[PDB]
Amino acid sequence: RYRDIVVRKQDGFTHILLSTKSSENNSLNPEVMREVQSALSTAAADDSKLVLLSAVGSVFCCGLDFIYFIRRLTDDRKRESTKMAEAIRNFVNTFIQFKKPIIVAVNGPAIGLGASILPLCDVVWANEKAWFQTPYTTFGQSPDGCSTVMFPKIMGGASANEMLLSGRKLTAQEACGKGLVSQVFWPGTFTQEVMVRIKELASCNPVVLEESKALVRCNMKMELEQANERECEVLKKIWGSAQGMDSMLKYLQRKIDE
Amino acid sequence: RYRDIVVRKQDGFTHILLSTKSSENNSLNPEVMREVQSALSTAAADDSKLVLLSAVGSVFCCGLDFIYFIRRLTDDRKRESTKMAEAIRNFVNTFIQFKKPIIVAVNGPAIGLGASILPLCDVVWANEKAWFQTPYTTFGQSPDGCSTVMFPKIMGGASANEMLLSGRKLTAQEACGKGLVSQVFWPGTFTQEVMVRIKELASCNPVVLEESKALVRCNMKMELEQANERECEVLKKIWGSAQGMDSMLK
Amino acid sequence: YRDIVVRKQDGFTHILLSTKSSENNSLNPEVMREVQSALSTAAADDSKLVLLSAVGSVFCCGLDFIYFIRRLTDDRKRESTKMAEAIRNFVNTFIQFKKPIIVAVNGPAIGLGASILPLCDVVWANEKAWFQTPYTTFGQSPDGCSTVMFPKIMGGASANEMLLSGRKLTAQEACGKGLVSQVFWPGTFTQEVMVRIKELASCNPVVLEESKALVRCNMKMELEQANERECEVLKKIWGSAQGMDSMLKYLQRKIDEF
Fold it and tell me: So which residues are the signal peptide here (chain B)?
């Protein structure tokens, strides 16, 4: 009955795989976002020791589906812009509140909100096929997923502003240098290197896992909530204005002209 | 007319170039800092979308002109140590409050306050001729430019203390690994690379740029102001006293 | 002192770890009390800084678990309380210390042996050194304020990987992740350190101290609060029903098998 994700619960952990059918290329829309929240809600309440999040196919996550979004905005700009900003806020908050470890395997591009959510997970393992970009300014939006606070925290201001203002694309290795990725594995053995460590993690006392994450997350929880809310209030402002989609349209024009 | 800087307003941005006459090696005396501040006031008020900061010459910025400063010190410690501290504090504060993006292109050495000011700008692009150092302890001064808070935040305590206490020099690649530089470019195409990126940023919605900067900068602004205040009080204490020019050496 | 060598000369105090009552420079409450005593004396005398290093092929393999297990067989409840307080007091000595502590790491730093390092000022490592916090594998939550300091120095992805997954970092990898100031080759390491210590010791002691005070002031209360939280969780874990399930594992492992 989930349409856009595959969920598997086995060997002490829940595995959630992004596999979107209501949107292309693992892009996010409110329906995809709700299914991830539902799957994480169940994992938070069952005996899962941790969650592994990964993706089916060649893209980890393209971030927001702006074509889906523009169609909504043409129907009722004021109502739909509010609704998208709240959907994002709730989606992001799910990651902020989640009490067990979220381990991410990134095997392809992670773009926009698909990259911004990574600092809200616990461990990120990538291979060289993965790259990371937050092309917010290109799409004409301010940042999301608490990246306005988290990117300066993990890579420092100079690097964070380059990603957030300049739309710099990072290889897996460069994202590791910039604190986005925990470790990079060869593509050929990526799955086995990820699964061996998930098995090791799932063999630990899940109380010790939870206590440790609680210790790491507690100095930042408030600040994350406050960031998420500020960012979403800005997005409402931008997406509710008549010119909100102009940068995105120019981007699409370039893409189709290429 | 500005003596120590060149200012070009064009194509959606203001380009400020350090090219000091009252000092050597783009050193900063209170006159240079006032001109930078005044050029930033006007960019903040006009239709400029962002500021590109770079330098003419083989040096980006040597930080404080300590000989200009020595001259002034032994004509009146109390008045001149107070004036220099407060000039640093207002210069640093201009960057803390500035609302639009400041992109910096660093094409040679950035030393002391010339390096410290970098974390208060937005993006820093460097070539291999650039290197970076904060030789505070060697000069017998404590740090400035909010580096006492910003350096630990961008590179971690161990690396920050090595910069601030030990006077370590970082190559452009090392400064990039330590969070001081956004990206390092080949010197051959450095100007081209910077300008293509500046043109892309200047084509963006200016309101989206400023909103984005505001969201990044808001959690830190009070901390940066308080750090700037603390640093400048410790400099008054040091420079005010008789034996605080004792390390300034040759 | 039985477990450390203290040399005061040339404007600095050199504290060398060289334990007799433990394997691999490991820390029992005895060793901890000597280190604290040596620091207390350096803090009050005319030393400008402290150089901390080790004798032998291991910097510090962290908590002396052989000693702790010897106590735990006697009285679990009483001895777990005393151990948590020993740690808390030890870590607090580093949080409070006003003079620069420079560390020369010439072999593995494990557990508390690695977690204290972000409480020091400058860390120089031999290319031979490596770094690990294998807390979870032995059923422990983290110590030494690493729950806050690791995310601050390497960002949450890398920090969680250290603290949850037991990742080992080479000296170079630990330099990229903010734990080590600079790495020197084994051949030149001793001389590289000493030329720099000599340079630092020739500086104005008041300038050194004011600089450190400016660097440490935004964080002192947060470090204290982190130390107290971590020590509380350690008490609760060690007092738990499953709290000892993973500790004895230690007896069967060499230090490069954690």
Answer: none
The amino acid sitting at C93 is T
First to last CA, chain A: 39
Half-sphere exposure of A207 (CA within 13 A, CB side): 16
Chain C within 8 Å of A36 (Cβ-Cβ)?
no
Per the CB < 8 Å rule, is C214 touching B223? Answer: no
Contact (CB<8Å) B155/C178: yes
Q: Which fold, A1-202?
A: 2-enoyl-CoA Hydratase; Chain A, domain 1 (3.90.226)
DSSP C25: T
Chain C neighbours (≥3 Cβ pairs under 8 A) are A, B
Helix (H, G, I), strand (E, B) or coil at A203: coil
Q: How far apart are CA A14 and CA A12, in angstroms?
A: 7
Q: What is the CB neighbour count within 10 angstroms for residue A47? A: 10
* Chain C residues close to B234, C-beta within 8 Å: 210, 214
Is residue B64 flagged as an active site residue?
Answer: yes
Residue-range domain boundaries for chain B = 1-202, 203-250
B 196-235 residues inside an 8 A Cβ radius of C: 223, 227, 230-231, 234
Residue with tokens 């970076």: B132
CATH architecture of the domain with range C1-201: Alpha-Beta Complex (3.90)
Q: Is B164 a catalytic residue?
A: no
Rounded Cα distance, C165 and C160, in Å: 7
Interface size between A and B, measured as CB pairs under 8 A? 100
- In CATH terms, C202-258 corresponds, of 3.30.70.260, 3.30.1360.120, 1.10.10.10, 1.10.12.10, to 1.10.12.10
